Amino acid sequence: AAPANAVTADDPTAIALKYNQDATKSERVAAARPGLPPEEQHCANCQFMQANVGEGDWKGCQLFPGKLINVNGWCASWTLKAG
Numbered sequence: 182a183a184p185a186n187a188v189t190a191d192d193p194t195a196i197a198l199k200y201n202q203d204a205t206k207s208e209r210v211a212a213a214r215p216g217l218p219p220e221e222q223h224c225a226n227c228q229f230m231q232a233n234v235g236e237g238d239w240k241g242c243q244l245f246p247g248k249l250i251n252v253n254g255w256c257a258s259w260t261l262k263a264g
Protein backbone atom coordinates (compact mmCIF):
# COMPACT_ATOMS: atom_id res chain seq x y z
CA ALA A 182 0.00 0.00 0.00
CA ALA A 183 1.31 3.44 -0.86
CA PRO A 184 1.83 6.06 1.82
CA ALA A 185 -0.73 8.80 2.15
CA ASN A 186 1.62 11.29 0.49
CA ALA A 187 2.71 9.02 -2.40
CA VAL A 188 2.91 10.60 -5.81
CA THR A 189 -0.24 9.48 -7.61
CA ALA A 190 -1.14 8.95 -11.25
CA ASP A 191 -3.38 12.07 -11.33
CA ASP A 192 -0.69 14.46 -10.10
CA PRO A 193 -0.08 16.95 -12.95
CA THR A 194 3.69 16.80 -12.62
CA ALA A 195 3.60 12.99 -12.44
CA ILE A 196 1.61 12.97 -15.70
CA ALA A 197 3.97 15.43 -17.38
CA LEU A 198 7.06 13.44 -16.29
CA LYS A 199 5.45 10.02 -16.97
CA TYR A 200 6.15 8.85 -13.43
CA ASN A 201 5.21 5.35 -12.41
CA GLN A 202 5.85 3.80 -9.01
CA ASP A 203 6.89 0.62 -10.86
CA ALA A 204 9.67 1.22 -13.42
CA THR A 205 8.65 -2.01 -15.19
CA LYS A 206 5.39 -0.21 -16.04
CA SER A 207 7.18 2.88 -17.38
CA GLU A 208 8.28 4.31 -20.69
CA ARG A 209 11.96 4.46 -19.72
CA VAL A 210 12.95 2.64 -22.94
CA ALA A 211 11.16 5.18 -25.16
CA ALA A 212 12.75 8.13 -23.35
CA ALA A 213 16.30 6.76 -23.55
CA ARG A 214 17.52 9.18 -20.91
CA PRO A 215 21.29 9.33 -20.77
CA GLY A 216 23.56 7.87 -18.09
CA LEU A 217 22.58 4.21 -18.00
CA PRO A 218 20.85 1.85 -20.43
CA PRO A 219 17.13 2.48 -19.91
CA GLU A 220 16.23 -0.92 -18.44
CA GLU A 221 18.67 -0.15 -15.57
CA GLN A 222 17.03 3.15 -14.56
CA HIS A 223 14.78 3.56 -11.52
CA CYS A 224 14.41 6.02 -8.64
CA ALA A 225 16.98 4.27 -6.42
CA ASN A 226 19.81 5.19 -8.83
CA CYS A 227 18.52 8.72 -9.57
CA GLN A 228 20.21 11.94 -8.44
CA PHE A 229 16.87 13.39 -7.31
CA MET A 230 15.98 10.57 -4.89
CA GLN A 231 16.30 11.68 -1.26
CA ALA A 232 17.45 8.79 0.85
CA ASN A 233 16.97 10.67 4.13
CA VAL A 234 13.21 11.30 3.43
CA GLY A 235 10.52 8.66 3.92
CA GLU A 236 10.85 5.04 4.99
CA GLY A 237 11.58 1.73 3.39
CA ASP A 238 10.74 1.66 -0.32
CA TRP A 239 9.02 5.08 -0.14
CA LYS A 240 11.57 7.88 -0.33
CA GLY A 241 11.70 11.55 -1.26
CA CYS A 242 12.15 13.03 -4.71
CA GLN A 243 13.40 16.58 -4.96
CA LEU A 244 10.97 17.22 -7.86
CA PHE A 245 7.91 16.18 -5.80
CA PRO A 246 8.11 18.28 -2.64
CA GLY A 247 6.04 16.97 0.24
CA LYS A 248 5.48 13.60 -1.43
CA LEU A 249 7.09 10.17 -1.61
CA ILE A 250 8.12 8.10 -4.63
CA ASN A 251 8.85 4.38 -4.73
CA VAL A 252 12.54 3.43 -5.03
CA ASN A 253 11.48 0.99 -7.77
CA GLY A 254 9.76 3.73 -9.81
CA TRP A 255 10.83 5.92 -12.70
CA CYS A 256 10.06 9.23 -14.40
CA ALA A 257 11.43 11.07 -17.42
CA SER A 258 13.59 13.34 -15.26
CA TRP A 259 15.65 10.27 -14.24
CA THR A 260 19.28 11.41 -13.93
CA LEU A 261 22.18 9.23 -12.77
CA LYS A 262 23.01 9.46 -9.06
CA ALA A 263 26.44 11.06 -9.31
CA GLY A 264 26.82 12.49 -5.80
Ligand code: SF4
Nearest residue numbers: 224227229230242256
Ligand atom coordinates in the same frame (compact mmCIF):
# COMPACT_ATOMS: atom_id res chain seq x y z
S1 SF4 B 1 13.32 12.41 -10.67
FE1 SF4 B 1 14.35 10.48 -10.23
S2 SF4 B 1 13.74 9.95 -8.06
FE2 SF4 B 1 12.30 11.50 -8.80
S3 SF4 B 1 10.52 10.25 -9.60
FE3 SF4 B 1 11.91 10.74 -11.38
S4 SF4 B 1 13.28 8.93 -11.55
FE4 SF4 B 1 12.27 8.87 -9.46
